Design a protein around this ligand. Structure first.
Ligand SMILES: Nc1ncnc2c1ncn2[C@@H]1O[C@H](CSCC[C@H](N)C(=O)O)[C@@H](O)[C@H]1O
Lengths: 265, 265
């Protein structure tokens, strides 16, 4: 009679919460989407095996245009689950789907899971110091998105860190690397010349958070722009003003140049 | 000879991830801390029962001053777990603990779990719109801290939302309620008179995130300041200007007054 939004976590099927698993195991029908993010350490089959159910995967169009025609009708006679990578409501437009559920007279519940938004903590950067977040989107035809550059500028101006979600074209199986994001940013800098992102800018890369051995690297763009950070997904972070201990962690844990230990308070 | 930082998640004993539970079960020693936050929807006994391991609770001093003398030694010839509410390394001083591990020749791994930082997405407010975060601290003696006031001001000025953690005294199990936080902010407003937090300010209250039945309320301070939001912990958010979709979610899901559709958009 109800609908469950259940997050599956960062990397593999075991990143789901115990609460999410027990409820999913008992749902009559299970739907899911895998276009809002990439869970690099698992497969649909493994997820199905864990939950013990068949999973009908939906495309962005199925969801955005037909959620109330495909999923909601099932929640009327049965308990339905809608699975998503990471946390279902983080950096997705899935929250609006709860409004659709309400309008169809369907109660909905949300089961959270680890999200890349909080996983940034593993970078050593104080999470309360992050400012506005942004997404580095692939240019399309003659359209070249640049707003994410202004976000960095605004945050850096305030000494705040900037989290940069990276683009994804699931149907093309394309996942933007931190390298590609850095190249795009350098191109925007050349254009706006704001001194926001250059070869000397310190950045942090977090790849495959959720895995036991994620890649966590910190350093100057000039040195990292061509470094191999491993398979996607990746996120790029442009730190603002660093606290001594943040710098220490970046150096000791993320292999940053010891020279960043010296902060210009 | 491995140290596992494992998150317990949001509310109860089922908020830990499958990965976290299975790893904890394989550890010879299990430590935990409940001074940064408490699992209001469960008990140490229930957590111990679920993990099937005795759990040695550590105080703030045990961790901050003697982590290397209590936890790390056991990690030399055994697998050790350090459990914390939410997602590991979110609490400001925890990231540094990994440096201590490295210095002691101990490998450490992070097992993520849901954090309030990402769980607040259930309020319908877009995650990318959150700015710098802060904690509302009780004034005391001749000390009247107000920086959290300035954080709200700077975020809202840039159309960003402000996540506010409320004061907590874990040992004495004493919580600051959303109501108290609002009263405090009004008091700060009367002093700084910056037009940042008044009776007409729109706020959102999230209680018991993680529970299947959390309290999500949105409205003006003059109407919510004396409302009962249930048992703690409470999380207070001062949204910046709203996207119409954010406002609609707040109205349809959090019972916000229709008025916000024209006043705060
Ligand atoms: N495990 C992971 N490691 C690194 N980046 C990740 C990641 N999971 C998600 N991301 C980042 O976030 C983007 C998808 S945004 C959707 C996020 C999701 N709801 C969550 O809660 O995490 C990806 O393109 C990538 O840049």
């Amino acid at each position: 009679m109800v609908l469950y939004f259940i997050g599956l976590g960062l990397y593999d099927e075991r990143d789901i919460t115990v609460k999410g698993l027990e409820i999913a195991k008992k749902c009559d029908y299970v739907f899911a989407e895998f276009y809002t993010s990439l869970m690099a350490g698992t497969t649909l089959g493994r997820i199905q095996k864990l939950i013990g159910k068949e999973i009908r995967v939906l495309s962005r169009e199925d969801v955005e245009l037909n959620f109330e025609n495909i999923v909601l009708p099932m929640a009327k006679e049965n308990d339905v689950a809608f699975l998503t990578p990471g946390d279902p409501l983080v950096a997705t437009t899935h929250a609006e789907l709860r409004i659709r559920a309400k309008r169809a007279g369907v109660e909905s519940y949300v089961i959270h899971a680890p999200s890349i938004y909080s996983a940034v903590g593993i970078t050593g950067l104080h999470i309360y110091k992050f400012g506005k977040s942004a997404t580095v989107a692939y240019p399309e035809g003659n359209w070249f998105p640049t707003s994410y550059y202004d976000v960095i500028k605004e945050n850096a101006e305030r000494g705040l860190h900037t989290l940069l979600f990276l683009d994804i074209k699931a149907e093309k199986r394309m996942y933007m690397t931190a390298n590609e994001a850095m190249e795009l940013l350098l191109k925007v800098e050349d254009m706006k010349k704001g001194g926001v992102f250059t070869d000397d800018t310190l950045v942090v890369v977090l790849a495959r958070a959720g895995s036991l051995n994620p890649t966590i690297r910190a350093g100057y763009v000039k040195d990292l722009i061509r470094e191999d950070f491993g398979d996607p997904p990746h996120i790029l972070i442009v730190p603002g003003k660093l606290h001594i201990v943040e710098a220490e962690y970046l150096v000791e844990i993320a292999g940053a140049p010891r020279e960043i230990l010296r902060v210009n308070v």
